[PDB]
């Protein structure tokens, strides 16, 4: 009983058009963003504490 364990690669190396090419694994590359809704209220009209925060 039991199944083998695997590992997700971070870098992929292939041979395209006779040349060895290297790329990152798009299925595991970390990424982030900026919340536009929260960042749209950075104005001096509101309280200064909110602005500095």
């Amino acid at each position: 009983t039991g199944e083998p364990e695997y590992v997700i690669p971070d870098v992929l190396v292939r041979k395209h058009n006779g040349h060895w090419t290297v790329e990152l694994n798009s299925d595991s590359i970390p990424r982030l963003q900026i919340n536009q809704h929260y960042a749209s209220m950075c104005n001096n009209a509101r309280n200064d504490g909110d602005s500095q925060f």
């Binding site: 083998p4 364990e5 695997y6 590992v7």
Partner: protein, 49 residues
């Protein structure tokens, strides 16, 4: 299908309620024998070990 020599009559209750009585000569001549093909697959993968 196949061309079958048929008669319309009751035979001792063996064609009761849409039952069909078939001769042994039909079986011996392989007139309704069929071929079935099945596929199986084995996959060898790469592990960390």
């Amino acid at each position: 299908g196949q061309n079958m020599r048929v008669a319309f009559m009751p035979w001792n209750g063996y064609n009761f309620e849409d039952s069909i009585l078939v001769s042994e000569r039909v079986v011996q001549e392989d007139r309704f024998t069929t071929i079935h093909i099945q596929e199986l697959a084995c996959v060898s993968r790469d592990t960390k070990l």
